[PDB]
Amino acid sequence: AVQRAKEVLEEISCYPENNDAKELKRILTQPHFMALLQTHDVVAHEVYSD
C-alpha cells in the first residue's frame, strides 16, 4: 500500500502543473498516512503474501 502511494508521488511529482499533485504528494508523504498504510501491509503480508 505504501509502495503504491510512493509510486504515485513520483508520477505526480514529475508534473509541476497539477496543483493537486503537489498537495497530494505532501499528504501521501507524511509518515502519518504511511503509518496507516504500514498497517495495510503488516496484515495483508501476514494474511496471504507468502
Binding site: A1, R4, A5, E7, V8, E11, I12, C14, Y15, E17, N18, D20, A21, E23, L24, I27, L28, Q30, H32, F33, A35, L36, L37, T39, H40, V43, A44
Partner: protein, 57 residues
C-alpha cells in the same frame, strides 16, 4: 490524526487529478482503492479508536 482529512484529501486529490487526465491515472485509481477499500477503513478506525483508547485508559 488528520488521517480522515489527509486520506479523504488524498482520495479527492487523486480523483481531482484523475478528472484532469494529465498523468497516468492508473496508479492514482489504484491508490483510490487502497485507501477507499473497506480494509483501510477498518485500519483507519483503529488509529482514531486507539487515540480515544489512550484517553480512556
Amino acid at each position: 490524526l488528520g488521517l480522515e482529512r489527509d486520506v479523504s484529501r488524498a482520495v479527492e486529490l487523486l480523483e481531482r487529478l484523475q478528472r484532469s487526465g494529465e498523468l497516468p491515472p492508473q496508479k492514482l485509481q489504484a491508490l483510490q482503492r487502497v485507501l477507499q477499500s473497506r480494509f483501510c477503513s477498518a485500519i483507519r478506525e483503529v488509529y482514531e479508536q486507539l487515540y480515544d483508547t489512550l484517553d480512556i485508559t
